[PDB]
Design a protein around this ligand. Structure first.
Ligand code: HEM
Ligand code: HEM
Ligand code: HEM
Ligand code: HEM
Ligand SMILES: CC(C)(Oc1ccc(CC(=O)Nc2cccc(NC(=O)Cc3ccc(OC(C)(C)C(=O)O)cc3)c2)cc1)C(=O)O
Ligand SMILES: CC(C)(Oc1ccc(CC(=O)Nc2cccc(NC(=O)Cc3ccc(OC(C)(C)C(=O)O)cc3)c2)cc1)C(=O)O
Lengths: 141, 146, 141, 146
């Protein structure tokens, strides 16, 4: 569970991301595709080249869903309900891949927020990404 | 994979009692029932709505025997799994887009099927030998991913 | 989320385990130590030889906790709170190991329940074990 | 492990700018804060209750320096990580009883620290090369487990 301290850390870090959220979402996807090549099997229909507008467009959707989740930290299951159905019944992404994207999102935040990414904020962000991942896979079976 | 001569005989001995077509259909059907997201590659197989629909589906059965037949032939090359599954690895990555995590899930479902099928003959040491094999085959199939 | 059909399947399968819960618990541990040797790192203070009193005794404690979870399947977080605190604050077993013990428990039940281990029951037991593992690691951080 | 010329150049060039003493303390401290259960191997280190206590702990800093120091030696032997870490692998298994999964966690925390420290210089291609290296070191260290 996210403590009051965790929620404050997450809203503070994401607040600093601000309008750069979409750019960071695309960077996190590029990091994941390069570091963990197996994740590319879910995007055979995408041009995965660096600078690809399809990855930049998808990065923005992922980042917007995260912004929505931060705004509804106390009510994530309902805020992310359509996304849980989508991943559980259509996309069917194996659960292990959520840990790979979460790691790459963390690396992207570390690379962009040097002053904000303290050890305490790092721990809170990691807990937040595991909760989002838990919600998105709650309807798998 | 490194198997002691005793682990190899344990694997081969039990395998000679396996009805490959039957166990193949059983393993793939259970994979699709227990981990439903694996159904993503099989939309053309038709009705996969319930556990009974999956187990009785003739296309699931036919694919199960194809998958287990290649696994069976691989047992004769336990010392060279990577070279034996190189082409199948490339096919699964480049054309089929199968996340390698699926191979690990199938391997664990196969171990449960063998335990259900053999009961007490599927001893803890025999399971350990089969665990190394399914991990070895999963790694061999994922080696050409890029 | 365990559905009503899952709870019905788990209760039926466990009822059948019955008085063998302790010996099946001991067998699942032995299968884990042999198949996944890294799990032995948490038991350096145990005589892990086949049939030892410590493994049979520990196997019995694991099975009782599992029978308790089956008896209170609608309220697992509360039923297992003491065990949840024990694993999060004292034992500190890495979460990956719960997947390994769950697989070995599933193999033990398959080998002992020829009539009951149908595909639907197999899916229900796997979900049940994943739920128990989730409750036991819920207080880790 | 097998790295392409550019990946080996990326790993080596970045490492020449790493102050092992400071980076090691950061990586170990963050491991203990972000994944608290890893504190089970360090009961004799003192105060580890708060993030500030862990990060300022002199014993956490001294140990981090030892760990990354051994890690450094491995970068000089990327072609033979298993031979390089065989003795340390046995030590961690037989005397320390450290679950190898901890090596994976430390490797990922190290990648986060490098990104935090280097910013835009830790590009996606550089991270990919480091992920291969940390997975290789983790595997080399788990190799002698039995
Ligand atoms: C932080 C976790 C994640 C979030 C918030 C997220 C969110 C989303 C969103 C917002 C969409 C777009 C739905 C729409 O069009 O309205 C989507 C699509 C998709 N996601 Fe996820 N996702 C996550 C993790 C994953 C992972 C781990 C993978 C696989 C490696 C993945 C693969 C996909 C795929 C293939 C699509 C379809 C893209 C397309 O065809 O346009 N997702 N996701
Ligand atoms: C021990 C594991 C496996 C082995 C040895 C194996 C083997 C094979 C073989 C021999 C083929 C035929 C290739 C050809 O037509 O040239 C095939 C096809 C295929 N496999 Fe795998 N496979 C395994 C696991 C999996 C898993 C777990 C999935 C996904 C859940 C999967 C999905 C597919 C698909 C979709 C095809 C194409 C079927 C068709 O076109 O009719 N495989 N596999
Ligand atoms: C189905 C999941 C599990 C259940 C139900 C469970 C249950 C228990 C119970 C009931 C105890 C006894 C506590 C007492 O004596 O008061 C215990 C102790 C312990 N468990 Fe867990 N456990 C599970 C998974 C794990 C895993 C995966 C490992 C490690 C591979 C593990 C390692 C330990 C250790 C080392 C102890 C202490 C044993 C001793 O020194 O006596 N547990 N657990
Ligand atoms: C990057 C991987 C790692 C390397 C290269 C490494 C290296 C070392 C080395 C060189 C020693 C010093 C032994 C001596 O002074 O004789 C050691 C000790 C130790 N390591 Fe590891 N280690 C690694 C990861 C870990 C992890 C992740 C844990 C647990 C979270 C761990 C726990 C320990 C402990 C408990 C000691 C003993 C400390 C003491 O003297 O009290 N190590 N390690
Ligand atoms: C297909 C693929 C990619 O399959 C994989 C991939 C990765 C792995 C292992 C992996 O790399 N793990 C990983 C990678 C990157 C980051 C992390 N981080 C963590 O998982 C952090 C963590 C750990 C335990 C946690 O447990 C608690 C109880 C605290 C929780 O979940 O909240 C939470 C978070 C883990 C295994 C198979 C493969 O074959 O290569
Ligand atoms: C220390 C150790 C053991 O480290 C690792 C590293 C990665 C792994 C990966 C692993 O082997 N996974 C594994 C092994 C055996 C059985 C299983 N089974 C499952 O995970 C079943 C499963 C899968 C997805 C699930 O997701 C949903 C969303 C359904 C859920 O959580 O409920 C739930 C259950 C998984 C294991 C050990 C090592 O180095 O050997």
């Amino acid at each position: 569970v996210l403590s009051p301290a965790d929620k404050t850390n997450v809203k503070a870090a994401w607040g600093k991301v601000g309008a750069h959220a979409g750019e960071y979402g695309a960077e996190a996807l590029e990091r994941m595709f390069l570091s963990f090549p197996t994740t590319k099997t879910y995007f055979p229909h995408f041009d995965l080249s660096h600078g690809s507008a399809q990855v930049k467009g998808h990065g923005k959707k992922v980042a917007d869903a995260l912004t929505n989740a931060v705004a509804h930290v106390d009510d994530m299951p309902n805020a992310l309900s359509a996304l849980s159905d989508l991943h559980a019944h259509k996309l069917r992404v194996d659960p292990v891949n959520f840990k790979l994207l979460s790691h790459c999102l963390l690396v992207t935040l570390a690379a962009h927020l040097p002053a904000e990414f303290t050890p305490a904020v790092h721990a809170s962000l990691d807990k937040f990404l595991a909760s989002v991942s838990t919600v998105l896979t709650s309807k798998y079976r | 994979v490194h198997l002691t001569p005793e682990e190899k005989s344990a694997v081969t001995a039990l395998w000679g009692k396996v009805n490959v077509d039957e166990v193949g259909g059983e393993a793939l059907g259970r994979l699709l029932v227990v981990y439903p997201w694996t159904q993503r590659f099989f939309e053309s197989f038709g009705d996969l709505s319930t556990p009974d629909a999956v187990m009785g589906n003739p296309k699931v059965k036919a694919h199960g025997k194809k998958v287990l037949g290649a696994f069976s032939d691989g047992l004769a090359h336990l010392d060279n799994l990577k070279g034996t599954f190189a082409t199948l690895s490339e096919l699964h990555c480049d054309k089929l887009h199968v996340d390698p995590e699926n191979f690990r899930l199938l391997g664990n479902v196969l171990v449960c099927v063998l335990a259900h099928h053999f009961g007490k003959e599927f001893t803890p040491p025999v399971q350990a030998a089969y665990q190394k094999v399914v991990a070895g085959v999963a790694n061999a199939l994922a080696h050409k991913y890029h």
